[PDB]
């Protein structure tokens, strides 16, 4: 009835493989570890594609032609899977078989997703807004504000246009953090974490 | 037994204030670290009832002391303004070698010394008694966790925020009976309950999805140990994070009220 924990016993034995689809088959199909890894992996899959469904028009319905090669690439470059997650998928996309089909209809959802994830998960008390820049979005930025009123009718992520032009970031993306809910003085872009 | 509901998204406000008006819940449990840039008075004013705190992303087992301390000081002002009935947090593995988990990990309960030192530091920072939640185990840490939490509580003074549905995931997943938690259940006055789902590729493995009505084994648990759960000053928070449908929640709220009648 129960599924055997097979080569392992506790979640701590599985930590290293929780985000590595290529090493999942090394566990028995009937084993509980295989299932536990599958749940962690589908969590990665769904965070990526539920939030950015237009990426599946590239991969196809299973997402595999993005999911597998990107997960392998994130381990190779030791990415943190931080709020930048989506931005790094787009970066990977720019060097993939799909690089010719990227346009702003694909860029803006991944920018909105990273801005959304920062403002939901970041816990730096001194950072109130994230500002995202991209070489494919001149003069504007994507800003993520942390919730500061239970009664806000607007979206927490907005595309803001700058009156004074902005330097294109050095890489595809750049970001900076804002201590309050205004933007005065441009401190320069920082490159993506990890 | 008081019945609460968990407030995590600002779009549910109108539905939660309606649940309060209609006397379907007695208090609101907020995922308070989602709101530490709100004015704390404004949240106090939005609920005409007692509030409780649940902290999700302190990451107090791994977070650097400076950023941990700042969050604590901010939560300490929220505690002053709102006087929450209790303050609660988790025992979760968030990051492996700098890589964030998206489905969070059960802690290796062998690592007691580490958890204990970190829990003491975080409870200190918060300035109040802390309640720590049990994990919905998939792997066999489930069998280790009751005595781990019992020892942790007696050595540090923390409490247990006993999550009944997580314990039943653990039972369904690992065999570890919920009766292991008997002693904790008769001690703590604070509980959590929710619906759970299944792994997509294996219905026998249970997942803490908080997205549907309570299961029958979860209701039997609460009902057959209703004397052990209910207590002077006892509370149970119903939790729904997904498919936040008013009517589906209203039946589960009513099911709790049937199991724990008002007098
Ligand atoms: Fe929780
Ligand atoms: Fe819970
Ligand atoms: Fe749960």
Per the structure, the complete domain to which residue B52 belongs is given by 2-259
Q: Nearest-5° angle of CA B203, CA A121, CA B249?
A: 50
d(C-alpha B251, C-alpha B255), whole Å: 6
d(C-alpha B191, C-alpha B219), whole Å: 14
d(C-alpha B156, C-alpha B186), whole Å: 19
Is B210 known to sit in a ligand binding site?
Answer: yes
E strands within B172-254?
190-194, 197-199, 202-207, 235-239
Nearest to A45 by CA among A64, A27, A32: A64
Nearest to B102 among A1, A40, A123 (CB): A40
Per-residue tokens: A172: 């595809």
In chain B, after which residues is the C-to-N distance over 2.5 Å, breaking the chain? none
Classified as helix, coil or strand, B105 is: strand
* Resolution, angstroms, 1 dp: 2.3
Nearest to B192 by CA among B18, B22, B2: B2
Q: How many residues does chain B have?
A: 263
Q: Are strands B190-194 and B235-239 parallel, antiparallel or unpaired?
A: parallel
Which helix or strand (DSSP H or E) is residue A176 part of?
Answer: strand A173-178
DSSP letter at B106? E
In chain B, which residues have their Cβ closer than 8 Å to the Cβ of A18?
96, 101, 103, 105
Q: How many CA atoms lie within 13 A of B207 on its CB side?
A: 19
Long-range contacts of A156-159 (CB under 8 A, 24+ apart): A156/A116, A156/A119, A157/A112, A157/A115, A157/A116, A157/A119, A159/A108
Contacts with A132 (C-beta within 8 Å, 6 or more apart), sequence order: A87, A111, A114, A115, A141, A142, A143, A144, A173, A174, A175
- CATH number of the domain enclosing B76: 3.20.20.150
Helices (H), A26-103: 32-51, 56-59, 64-76, 85-94
Nearest to B213 by CA among B233, B185, B242, B182: B242
CB < 8 Å from B in window 23-42 of A: 32-33, 35-36, 38-40, 42
Helices (H), chain A: 32-51, 56-59, 64-76, 85-94, 104-121
d(C-alpha B128, C-alpha B139), whole Å: 32
The chain A residue lying nearest B73, using CA atoms, is A125
Q: How far is A70 from chain B (nearest CA, A)?
A: 15
Total number of domains constituting chain B: 1
8 Å CB contact between B86 and A22: no
8 Å CB contact between B159 and B132: yes
User: Tokens 């997904």 — which residue?
Assistant: B242
d(C-alpha B262, C-alpha B2), whole Å: 9
d(C-alpha B156, C-alpha A156), whole Å: 39
State the Cα torsion B97-B100-B103-B105 to the nearest 10°. Answer: 40
Method of determination? X-ray
3-state secondary structure labels for all residues of B139-178? CCHHHHHHHHHHHHHHHHCCEEEEEHHHHHHHHHHHCCCH
d(C-alpha A113, C-alpha A55), whole Å: 12
Neighbours of ion ligand 3 (CB under 5 A): B 163, 165-166, 194, 208
Per-residue tokens: B122: 């975080």
Greatest alpha-carbon span in chain B: 52
What's phi and psi for B77, nearest 5 deg? -75, -35
Neighbours of ion ligand 2 (CB under 5 A): B 163, 192
The chain A residue lying nearest B99, using CA atoms, is A80
CB < 8 Å from A in window 201-260 of B: 201-202, 204-205, 207
The Cβ of residue B114 has, within 10 Å, a number of other Cβ atoms equal to 12
DSSP letter at B48? S
DSSP H helix total and E strand total for chain A:
5, 4
> CA of B197: how far to CAs of A35, B42, B136, B231, in Å?
14, 35, 12, 29
Residue A178 touches chain B, beta carbons under 8 Å: no
Q: Are strands B27-31 and B2-7 parallel, antiparallel or unpaired?
A: parallel
Neighbours of ion ligand 1 (CB under 5 A): B 133
d(C-alpha A50, C-alpha A62), whole Å: 12
Q: Give the strands of the sheet with A157-161, arranged side by side.
A: A157-161, A140-145, A129-134, A173-178
């Amino acid at each position: 009835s129960l599924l055997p924990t097979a080569p392992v016993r506790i979640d701590a034995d599985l930590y290293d493989d929780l985000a590595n689809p290529a090493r999942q088959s090394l566990y028995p199909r009937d084993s509980r570890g295989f299932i536990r890894i599958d749940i962690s992996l589908r969590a990665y899959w769904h965070t990526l594609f539920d939030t950015c469904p237009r990426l599946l028009e590239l991969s196809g319905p299973s997402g595999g032609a993005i999911f597998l090669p990107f997960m392998a690439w994130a381990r190779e470059n030791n990415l943190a899977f931080d709020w930048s997650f989506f931005l790094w998928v787009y970066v990977w996309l720019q060097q993939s078989e799909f690089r010719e089909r990227l346009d702003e209809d694909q860029l803006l959802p991944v920018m909105t997703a990273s801005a959304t994830r920062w403002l939901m998960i970041d816990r730096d008390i001194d950072a109130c807004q994230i500002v995202l820049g991209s070489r494919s979005l001149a003069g504007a930025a994507v800003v993520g504000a942390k919730i500061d009123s239970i009664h806000c009718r607007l979206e927490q992520v907005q595309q803001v246009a700058f009156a004074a032009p902005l330097p294109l970031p050095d890489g595809e993306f750049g970001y900076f953090l804002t201590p309050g809910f205004e933007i005065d003085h441009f401190p320069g872009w920082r490159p993506l974490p990890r | 037994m008081q019945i609460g509901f968990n407030f995590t998204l600002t779009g549910t406000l109108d539905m939660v204030q309606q649940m309060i008006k209609e006397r379907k819940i007695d208090y609101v449990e907020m995922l308070i670290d989602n709101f530490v840039h709100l004015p704390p008075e404004q949240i106090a004013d939005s609920f005409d009832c007692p509030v409780a705190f649940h902290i999700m992303l302190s990451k107090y087992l791994e977070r650097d002391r400076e950023a941990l301390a700042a969050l604590g000081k901010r939560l300490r002002r929220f505690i002053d303004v709102m006087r929450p009935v209790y303050v609660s947090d988790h025992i979760l593995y968030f990051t492996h070698n700098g890589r964030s988990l998206f489905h969070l990990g059960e802690i290796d309960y062998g690592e007691y010394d580490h958890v204990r030192s970190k829990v003491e530091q975080w409870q200190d920072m918060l300035g109040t008694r802390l309640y720590l939640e049990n994990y919905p185990s998939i792997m066999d840490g489930a069998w280790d966790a009751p005595s781990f939490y019992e020892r942790l509580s007696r050595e540090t003074g923390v409490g247990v925020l006993f999550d009944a549905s997580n314990a039943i995931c653990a039972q369904n997943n690992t065999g570890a009976p919920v009766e292991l938690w008997k002693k904790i259940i008769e001690t703590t006055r604070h509980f959590h309950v929710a619906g759970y789902g299944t792994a997509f590729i294996e219905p026998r493995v249970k997942a803490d999805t908080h997205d549907r009505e309570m299961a029958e084994d979860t209701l039997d648990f609460l009902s057959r140990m209703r004397t052990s759960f209910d207590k002077p000053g006892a509370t149970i928070t119903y939790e729904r994070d997904f498919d936040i449908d008013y009517e589906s929640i209203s039946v589960d709220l009513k099911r709790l009220r049937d199991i724990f009648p008002c007098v």
